[PDB]
mmCIF file of C-alpha atoms and ligand atoms in Angstrom:
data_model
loop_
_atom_site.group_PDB
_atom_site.id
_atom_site.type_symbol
_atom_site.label_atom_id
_atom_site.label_comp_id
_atom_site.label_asym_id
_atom_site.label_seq_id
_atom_site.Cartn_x
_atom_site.Cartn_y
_atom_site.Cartn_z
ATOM 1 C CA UNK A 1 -5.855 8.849 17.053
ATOM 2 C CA UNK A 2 -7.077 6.065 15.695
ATOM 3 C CA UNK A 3 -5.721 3.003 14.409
ATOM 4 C CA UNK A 4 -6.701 -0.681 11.857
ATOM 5 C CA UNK A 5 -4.658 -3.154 10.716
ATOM 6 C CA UNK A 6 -6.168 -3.954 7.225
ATOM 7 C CA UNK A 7 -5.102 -7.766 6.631
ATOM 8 C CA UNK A 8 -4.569 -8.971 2.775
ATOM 9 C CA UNK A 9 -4.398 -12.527 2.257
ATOM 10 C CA UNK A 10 -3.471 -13.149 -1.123
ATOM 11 C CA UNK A 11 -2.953 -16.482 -3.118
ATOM 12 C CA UNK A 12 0.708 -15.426 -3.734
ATOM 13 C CA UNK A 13 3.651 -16.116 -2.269
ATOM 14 C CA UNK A 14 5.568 -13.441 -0.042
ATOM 15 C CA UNK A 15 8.237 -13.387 -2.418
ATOM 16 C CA UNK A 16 6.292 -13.019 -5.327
ATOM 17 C CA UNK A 17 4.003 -10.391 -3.222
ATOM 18 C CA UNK A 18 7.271 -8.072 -3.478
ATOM 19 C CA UNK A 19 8.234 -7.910 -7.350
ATOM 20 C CA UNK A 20 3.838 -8.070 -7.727
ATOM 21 C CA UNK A 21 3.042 -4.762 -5.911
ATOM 22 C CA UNK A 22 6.810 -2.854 -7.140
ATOM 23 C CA UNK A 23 5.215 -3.902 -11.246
ATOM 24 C CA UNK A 24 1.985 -2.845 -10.244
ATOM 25 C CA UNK A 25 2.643 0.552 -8.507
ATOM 26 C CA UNK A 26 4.897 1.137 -11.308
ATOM 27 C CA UNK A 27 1.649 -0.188 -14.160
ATOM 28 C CA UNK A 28 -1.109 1.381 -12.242
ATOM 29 C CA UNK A 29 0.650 4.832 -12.516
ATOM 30 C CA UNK A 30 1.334 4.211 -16.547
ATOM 31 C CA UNK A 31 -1.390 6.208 -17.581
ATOM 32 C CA UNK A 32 -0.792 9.020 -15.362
ATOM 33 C CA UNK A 33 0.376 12.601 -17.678
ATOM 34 C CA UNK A 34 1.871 14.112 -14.630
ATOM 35 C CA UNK A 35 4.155 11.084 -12.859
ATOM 36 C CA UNK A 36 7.663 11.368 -11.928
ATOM 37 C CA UNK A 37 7.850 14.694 -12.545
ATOM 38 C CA UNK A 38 8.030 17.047 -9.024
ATOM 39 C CA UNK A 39 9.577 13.716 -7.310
ATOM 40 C CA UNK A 40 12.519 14.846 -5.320
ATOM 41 C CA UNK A 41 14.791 12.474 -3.328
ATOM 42 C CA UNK A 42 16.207 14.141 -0.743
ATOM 43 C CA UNK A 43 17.626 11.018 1.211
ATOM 44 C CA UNK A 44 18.573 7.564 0.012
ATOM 45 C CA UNK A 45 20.842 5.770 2.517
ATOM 46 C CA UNK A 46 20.713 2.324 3.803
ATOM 47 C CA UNK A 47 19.773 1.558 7.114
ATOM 48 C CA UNK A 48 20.149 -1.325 10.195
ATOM 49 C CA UNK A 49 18.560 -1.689 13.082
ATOM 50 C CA UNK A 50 18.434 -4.662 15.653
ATOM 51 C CA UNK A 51 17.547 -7.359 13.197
ATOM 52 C CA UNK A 52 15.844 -4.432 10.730
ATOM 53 C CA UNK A 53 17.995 -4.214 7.934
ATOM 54 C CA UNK A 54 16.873 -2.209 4.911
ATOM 55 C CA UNK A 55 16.601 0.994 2.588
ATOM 56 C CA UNK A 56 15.299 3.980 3.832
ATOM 57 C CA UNK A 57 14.586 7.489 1.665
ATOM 58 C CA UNK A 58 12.881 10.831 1.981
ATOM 59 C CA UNK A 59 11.398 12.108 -0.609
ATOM 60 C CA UNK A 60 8.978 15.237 -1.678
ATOM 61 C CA UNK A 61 5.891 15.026 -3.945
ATOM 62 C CA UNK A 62 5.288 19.349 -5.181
ATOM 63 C CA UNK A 63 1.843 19.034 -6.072
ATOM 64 C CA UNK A 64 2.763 22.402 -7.438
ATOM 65 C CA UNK A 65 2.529 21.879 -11.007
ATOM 66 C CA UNK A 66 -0.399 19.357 -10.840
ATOM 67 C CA UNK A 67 -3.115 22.198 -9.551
ATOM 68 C CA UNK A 68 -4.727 24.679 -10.700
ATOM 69 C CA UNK A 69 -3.053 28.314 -10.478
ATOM 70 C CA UNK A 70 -5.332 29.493 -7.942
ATOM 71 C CA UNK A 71 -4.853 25.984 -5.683
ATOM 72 C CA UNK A 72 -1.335 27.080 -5.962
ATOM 73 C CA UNK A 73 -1.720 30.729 -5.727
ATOM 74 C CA UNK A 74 -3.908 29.955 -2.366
ATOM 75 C CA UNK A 75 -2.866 27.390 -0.894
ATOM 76 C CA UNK A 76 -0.273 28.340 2.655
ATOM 77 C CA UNK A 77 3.379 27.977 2.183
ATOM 78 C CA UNK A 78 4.184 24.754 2.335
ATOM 79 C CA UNK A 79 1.290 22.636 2.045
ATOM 80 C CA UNK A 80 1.197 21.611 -1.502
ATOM 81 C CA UNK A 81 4.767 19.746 -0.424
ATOM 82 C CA UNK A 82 4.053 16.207 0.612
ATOM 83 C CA UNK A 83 6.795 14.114 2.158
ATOM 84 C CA UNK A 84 7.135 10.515 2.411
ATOM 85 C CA UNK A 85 9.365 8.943 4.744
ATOM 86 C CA UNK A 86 10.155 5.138 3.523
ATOM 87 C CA UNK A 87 12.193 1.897 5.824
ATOM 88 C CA UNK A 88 11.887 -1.055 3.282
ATOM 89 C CA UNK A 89 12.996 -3.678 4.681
ATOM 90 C CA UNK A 90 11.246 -6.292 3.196
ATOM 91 C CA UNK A 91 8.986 -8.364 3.934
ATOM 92 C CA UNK A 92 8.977 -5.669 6.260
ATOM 93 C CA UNK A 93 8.131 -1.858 5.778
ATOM 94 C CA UNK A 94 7.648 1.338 7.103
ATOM 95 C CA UNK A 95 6.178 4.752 5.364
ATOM 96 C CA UNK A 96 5.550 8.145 6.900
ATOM 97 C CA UNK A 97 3.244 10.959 4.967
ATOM 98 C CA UNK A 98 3.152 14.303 5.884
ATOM 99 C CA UNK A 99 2.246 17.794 4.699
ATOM 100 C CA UNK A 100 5.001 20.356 4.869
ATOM 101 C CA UNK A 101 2.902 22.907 6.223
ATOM 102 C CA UNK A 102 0.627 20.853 8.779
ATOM 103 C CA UNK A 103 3.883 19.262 9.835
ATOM 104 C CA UNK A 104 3.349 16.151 12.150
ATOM 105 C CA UNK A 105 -0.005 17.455 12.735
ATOM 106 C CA UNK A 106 -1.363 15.640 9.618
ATOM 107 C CA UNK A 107 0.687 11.900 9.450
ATOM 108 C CA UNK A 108 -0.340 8.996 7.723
ATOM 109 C CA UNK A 109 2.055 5.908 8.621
ATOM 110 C CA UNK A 110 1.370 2.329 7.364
ATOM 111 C CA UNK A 111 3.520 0.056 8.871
ATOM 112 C CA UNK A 112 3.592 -3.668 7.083
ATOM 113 C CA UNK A 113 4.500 -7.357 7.639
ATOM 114 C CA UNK A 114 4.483 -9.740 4.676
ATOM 115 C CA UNK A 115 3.429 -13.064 5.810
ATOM 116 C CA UNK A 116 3.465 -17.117 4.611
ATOM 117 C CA UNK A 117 0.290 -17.203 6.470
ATOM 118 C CA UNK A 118 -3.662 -17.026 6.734
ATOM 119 C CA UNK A 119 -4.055 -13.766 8.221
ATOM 120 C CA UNK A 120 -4.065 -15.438 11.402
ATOM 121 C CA UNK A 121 -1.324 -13.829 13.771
ATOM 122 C CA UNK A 122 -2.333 -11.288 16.363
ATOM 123 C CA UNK A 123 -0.435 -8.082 17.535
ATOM 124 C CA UNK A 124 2.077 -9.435 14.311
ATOM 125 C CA UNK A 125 3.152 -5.847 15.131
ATOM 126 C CA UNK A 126 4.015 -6.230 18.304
ATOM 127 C CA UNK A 127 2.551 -3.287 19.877
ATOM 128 C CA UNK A 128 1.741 -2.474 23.504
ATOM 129 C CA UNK A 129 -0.766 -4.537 25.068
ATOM 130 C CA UNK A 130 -3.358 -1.655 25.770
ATOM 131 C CA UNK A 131 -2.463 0.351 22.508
ATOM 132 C CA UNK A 132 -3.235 -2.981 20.484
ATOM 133 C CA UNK A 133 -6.635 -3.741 22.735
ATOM 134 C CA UNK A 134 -7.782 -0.074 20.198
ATOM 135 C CA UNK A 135 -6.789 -1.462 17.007
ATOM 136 C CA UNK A 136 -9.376 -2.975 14.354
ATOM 137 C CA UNK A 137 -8.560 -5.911 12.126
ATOM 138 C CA UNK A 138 -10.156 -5.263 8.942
ATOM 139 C CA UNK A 139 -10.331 -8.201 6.131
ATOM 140 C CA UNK A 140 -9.979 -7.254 2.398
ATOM 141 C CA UNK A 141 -11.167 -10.171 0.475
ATOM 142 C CA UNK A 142 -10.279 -9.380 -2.954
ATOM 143 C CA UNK A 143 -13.004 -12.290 -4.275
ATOM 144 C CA UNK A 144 -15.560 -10.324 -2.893
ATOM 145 C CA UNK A 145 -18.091 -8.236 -4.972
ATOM 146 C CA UNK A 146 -19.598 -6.815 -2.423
ATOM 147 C CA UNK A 147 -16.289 -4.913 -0.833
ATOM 148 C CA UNK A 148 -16.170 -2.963 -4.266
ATOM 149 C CA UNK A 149 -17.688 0.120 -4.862
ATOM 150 C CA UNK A 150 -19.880 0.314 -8.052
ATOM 151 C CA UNK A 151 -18.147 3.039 -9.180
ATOM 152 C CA UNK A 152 -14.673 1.389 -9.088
ATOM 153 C CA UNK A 153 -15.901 -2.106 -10.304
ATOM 154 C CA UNK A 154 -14.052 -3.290 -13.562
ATOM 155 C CA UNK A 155 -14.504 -6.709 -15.092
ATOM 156 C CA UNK A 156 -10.931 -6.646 -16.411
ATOM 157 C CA UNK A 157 -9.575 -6.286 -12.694
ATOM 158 C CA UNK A 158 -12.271 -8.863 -11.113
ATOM 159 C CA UNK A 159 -10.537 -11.958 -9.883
ATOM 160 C CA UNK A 160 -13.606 -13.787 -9.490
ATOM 161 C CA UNK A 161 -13.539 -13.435 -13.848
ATOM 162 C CA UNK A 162 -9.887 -13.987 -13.914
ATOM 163 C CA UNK A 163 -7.608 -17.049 -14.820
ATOM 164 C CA UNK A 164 -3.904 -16.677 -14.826
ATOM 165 C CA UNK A 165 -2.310 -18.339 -17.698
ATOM 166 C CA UNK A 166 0.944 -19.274 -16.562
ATOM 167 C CA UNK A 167 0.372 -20.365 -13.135
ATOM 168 C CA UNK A 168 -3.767 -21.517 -13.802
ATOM 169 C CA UNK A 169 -4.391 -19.726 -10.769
ATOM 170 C CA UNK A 170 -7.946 -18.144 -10.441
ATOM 171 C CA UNK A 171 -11.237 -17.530 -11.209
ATOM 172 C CA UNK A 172 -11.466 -16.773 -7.150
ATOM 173 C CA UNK A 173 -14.732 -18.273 -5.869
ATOM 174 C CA UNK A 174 -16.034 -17.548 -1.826
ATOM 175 C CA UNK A 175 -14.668 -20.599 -0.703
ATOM 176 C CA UNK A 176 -10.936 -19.769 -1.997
ATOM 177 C CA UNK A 177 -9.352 -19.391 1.340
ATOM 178 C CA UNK A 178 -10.795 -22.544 2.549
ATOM 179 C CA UNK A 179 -9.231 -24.211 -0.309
ATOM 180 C CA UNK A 180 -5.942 -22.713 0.266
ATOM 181 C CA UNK A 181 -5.784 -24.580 3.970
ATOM 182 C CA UNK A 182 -6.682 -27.876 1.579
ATOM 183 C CA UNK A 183 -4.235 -27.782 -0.855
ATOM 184 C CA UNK A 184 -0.907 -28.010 -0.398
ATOM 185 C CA UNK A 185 0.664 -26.315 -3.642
ATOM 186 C CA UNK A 186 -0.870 -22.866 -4.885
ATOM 187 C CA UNK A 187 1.194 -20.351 -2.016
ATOM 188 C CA UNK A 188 -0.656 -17.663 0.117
ATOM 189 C CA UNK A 189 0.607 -14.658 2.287
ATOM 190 C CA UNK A 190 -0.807 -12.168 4.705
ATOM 191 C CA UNK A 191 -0.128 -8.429 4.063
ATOM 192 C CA UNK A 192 -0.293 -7.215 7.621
ATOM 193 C CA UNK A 193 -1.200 -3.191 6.541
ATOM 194 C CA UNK A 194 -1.415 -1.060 10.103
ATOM 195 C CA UNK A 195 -2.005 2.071 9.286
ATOM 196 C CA UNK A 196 -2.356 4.825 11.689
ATOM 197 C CA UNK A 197 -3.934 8.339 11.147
ATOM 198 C CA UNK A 198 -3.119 11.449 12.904
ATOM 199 C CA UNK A 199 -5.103 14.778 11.834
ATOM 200 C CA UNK A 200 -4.682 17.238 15.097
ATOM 201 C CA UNK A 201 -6.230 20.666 13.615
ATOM 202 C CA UNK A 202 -9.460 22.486 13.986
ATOM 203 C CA UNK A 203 -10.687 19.594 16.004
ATOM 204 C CA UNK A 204 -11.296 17.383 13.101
ATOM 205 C CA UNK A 205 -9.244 14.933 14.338
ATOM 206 C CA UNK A 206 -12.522 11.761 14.041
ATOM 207 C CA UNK A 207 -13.696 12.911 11.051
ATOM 208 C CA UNK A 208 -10.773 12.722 8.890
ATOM 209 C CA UNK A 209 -9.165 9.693 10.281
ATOM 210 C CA UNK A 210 -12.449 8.139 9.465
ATOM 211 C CA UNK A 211 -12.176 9.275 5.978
ATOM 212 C CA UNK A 212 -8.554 8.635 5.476
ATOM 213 C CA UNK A 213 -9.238 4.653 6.622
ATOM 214 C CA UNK A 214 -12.149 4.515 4.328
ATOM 215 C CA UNK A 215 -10.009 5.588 1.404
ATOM 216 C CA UNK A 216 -7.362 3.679 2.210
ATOM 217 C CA UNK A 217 -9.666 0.184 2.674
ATOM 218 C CA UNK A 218 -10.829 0.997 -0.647
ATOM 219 C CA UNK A 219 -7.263 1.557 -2.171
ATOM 220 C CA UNK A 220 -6.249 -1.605 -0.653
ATOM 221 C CA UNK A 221 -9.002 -3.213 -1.942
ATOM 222 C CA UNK A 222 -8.682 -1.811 -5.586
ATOM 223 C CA UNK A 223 -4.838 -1.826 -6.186
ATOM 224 C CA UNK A 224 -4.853 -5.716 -5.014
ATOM 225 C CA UNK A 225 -7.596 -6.907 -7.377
ATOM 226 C CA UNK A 226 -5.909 -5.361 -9.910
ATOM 227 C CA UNK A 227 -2.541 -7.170 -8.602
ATOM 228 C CA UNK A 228 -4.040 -10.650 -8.769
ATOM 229 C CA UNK A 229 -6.040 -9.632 -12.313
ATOM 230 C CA UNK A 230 -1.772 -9.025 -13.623
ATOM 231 C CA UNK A 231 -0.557 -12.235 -12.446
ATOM 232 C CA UNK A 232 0.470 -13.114 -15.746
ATOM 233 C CA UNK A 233 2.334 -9.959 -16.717
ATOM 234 C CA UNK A 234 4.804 -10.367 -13.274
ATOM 235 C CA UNK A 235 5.085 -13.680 -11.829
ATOM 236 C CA UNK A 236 7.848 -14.438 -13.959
ATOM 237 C CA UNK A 237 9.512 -11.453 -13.210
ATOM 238 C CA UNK A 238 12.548 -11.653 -10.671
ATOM 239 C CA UNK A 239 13.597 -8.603 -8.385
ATOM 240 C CA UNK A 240 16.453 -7.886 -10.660
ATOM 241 C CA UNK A 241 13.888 -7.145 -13.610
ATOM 242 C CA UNK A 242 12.200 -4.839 -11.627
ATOM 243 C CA UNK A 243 15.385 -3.096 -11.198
ATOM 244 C CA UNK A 244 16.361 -3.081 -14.799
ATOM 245 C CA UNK A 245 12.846 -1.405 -15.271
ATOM 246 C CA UNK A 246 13.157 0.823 -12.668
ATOM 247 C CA UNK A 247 16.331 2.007 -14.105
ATOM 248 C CA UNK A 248 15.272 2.095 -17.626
ATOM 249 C CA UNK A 249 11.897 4.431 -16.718
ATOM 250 C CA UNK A 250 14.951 7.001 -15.219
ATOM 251 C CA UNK A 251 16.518 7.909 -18.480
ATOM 252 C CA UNK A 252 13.691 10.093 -19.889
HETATM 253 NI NI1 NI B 301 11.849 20.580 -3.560
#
């Protein structure tokens, strides 16, 4: 099993990394015929745990309805149910994917610390010595061109083409970190993603952990660009807006 620990540094602050990436989950899935529907909360409780307090809910995504007849007709009992386990205790968080038919055998878990810092902690985890000697640090520099794929690229979601109007923040040149150590206003954070891949059958176990991390670099990579490019459409947002949305998008 193998395991990174993608590390986001972002010119926001933890605080405002929270109500940022609950608006743009919520925008980034706005265009999406077929969201919402087949979400099932089976558990929403909350939770404490030496020092760990937070939310935590199970719920099931039925891909059911989303694939063609024959995917459905096909596919073994079970394995069109996907189940995500969620802790969020922020700026700490836990999730949990599985399959309902591969059962633990196929688990994605991305465990996450929110930082006021420069990506510069090590083991920020805290895992065993040996287990962390395994582990990868991967940097996503959302500035950088050349960590998009062609395919993805959008000028509209580019920060190094975007200026936020109400807090003048951006275009992001190569050099932005470095000027984030030199200034002493503009706030930065450290999403500390470790995500951890588990895929047990038919002895595929390499190759789709490899994919998996590849496609979730990428996602990382996309979904924050596109984060920094909505600056101005959620940094004056507080956490009880994103509540009132949240509640308003459950009526329908
Ligand atoms: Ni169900």
């Amino acid at each position: 099993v193998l395991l990174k620990e993608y590390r986001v540094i972002l010119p926001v602050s933890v605080d405002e990394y929270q109500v940022g990436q609950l608006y743009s989950v919520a925008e980034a899935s706005k265009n999406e015929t077929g969201g919402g529907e087949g979400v099932e909360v089976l558990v929403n409780e909350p939770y404490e745990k030496d020092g760990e307090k937070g939310q935590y809910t199970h719920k099931i995504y039925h891909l059911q309805s989303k694939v063609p007849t024959f995917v459905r007709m096909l596919a073994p009992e079970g394995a069109l149910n996907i189940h995500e386990k969620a802790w969020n205790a922020y700026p700490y968080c836990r999730t949990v994917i599985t399959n309902e038919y591969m059962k633990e055998d196929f688990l994605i878990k991305i465990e996450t610390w929110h930082k006021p810092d420069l990506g510069t902690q090590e083991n920020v985890h805290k895992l065993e010595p040996e287990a962390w000697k395994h582990v990868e640090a991967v940097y996503i520099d959302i500035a950088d061109r050349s960590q998009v794929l062609s395919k993805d690229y959008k000028a509209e979601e580019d920060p190094a083409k975007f200026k936020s109007i109400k807090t003048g923040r951006g275009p992001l040149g190569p050099n932005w970190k470095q000027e984030l150590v030199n200034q002493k206003d503009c706030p930065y954070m450290c999403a500390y993603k470790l995500v951890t891949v588990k895929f047990k059958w038919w002895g595929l176990q390499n190759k789709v952990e490899n994919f998996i991390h590849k496609q979730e670099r990428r996602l990382f990579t996309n979904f924050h660009r596109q984060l920094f490019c909505w600056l101005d459409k959620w940094v004056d947002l507080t956490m009880d807006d994103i509540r009132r949305m949240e509640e308003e998008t459950k009526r329908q």
